[PDB]
Amino acid sequence: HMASATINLSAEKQVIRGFGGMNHPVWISDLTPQQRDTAFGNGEGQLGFTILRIHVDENRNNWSKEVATARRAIELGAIVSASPWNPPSNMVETFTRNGVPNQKRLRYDKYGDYVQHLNDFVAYMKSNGVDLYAISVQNEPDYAHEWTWWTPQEMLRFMRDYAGQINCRVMAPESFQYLKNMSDPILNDPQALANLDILGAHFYGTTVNNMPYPLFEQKGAGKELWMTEVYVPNSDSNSADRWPEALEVAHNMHNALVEGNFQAYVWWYIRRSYGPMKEDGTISKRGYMMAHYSKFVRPGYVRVDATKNPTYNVYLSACKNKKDNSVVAVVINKSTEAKTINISVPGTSIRKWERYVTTGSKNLRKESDINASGTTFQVTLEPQSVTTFV
């Protein structure tokens, strides 16, 4: 039997900003020179990442450790965003939170000093050849057992009365789970919303039903939407090549893009035993899942409407290159059976797709071209696979 899907090139959705991951040379080892190239180049055997995330150290004597990786990322065409975990210690005080004592927050009398600390980091990185794309108010203000807590109202006061002085695009609030209570106050206050440039969110435990954001569709004109940190489905030691488990990475990216309208998807540590690049410097199954998007859906491409679930266990997304109206379709098949789909692309002059396939036994393998019959491309997806058509 034969399933169907339609890609509508005239129904444009979000512009793609890019894909990438975290570097943190204070908590773990920096990327090496060769690993910087594997991450940020887009040749064969490279990931094609176009976003680097870094941390803003509370101790300025550590800032120089960021520079070499961030410079090489930019030279290879990536953008850089930075997130703080704590303010300098002289700006912090303690409080008791839900009966747990000794918890950290920014002193209310130090909000202006904290603006200056962020600006000092921006200017230091600029002096060193790293013009940051954006800087965040706080990493996970709502999951801060091990760092600095901010309530929705503390975040709001900072966004409204201080964030306009930051000499960079401002990212907020980076909830651990995209909890809307952290961001609704910013969207609902005209001055706080003016001082926002990127709505940042993490995805830990975020379900599909919680990926849409009606208030952001209503009030978010001119603001970018980025998923700035996750790992999925777990951080188990030495898990990065497990199959078919790695398919959950692809699915979570599909869901960010299509269910959440996200413009960016950013992993936690780039190099790690559960990450996209293994400790031996080679790409993991989880990394190939990312690569099906990152190598092909380049910054400035625009997502378009496409049948998202054409048959059980099959998931489709499509993005268009506005330079020539060509399309990139990424199709996941979680079934133990092969699936054949007629994909209609009305109004296209394109008549041939190339395809790259990942299964448990091959990585980004170039398979036989698809020749269209008129504007319909009939494709067959191997069981337990991801295919990118270009």
Binding site: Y143, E146, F176, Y204, G205, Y231, S235
Partner: peptide
């Protein structure tokens, strides 16, 4: 749940 995470980073723990």
């Amino acid at each position: 749940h995470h980073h723990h």
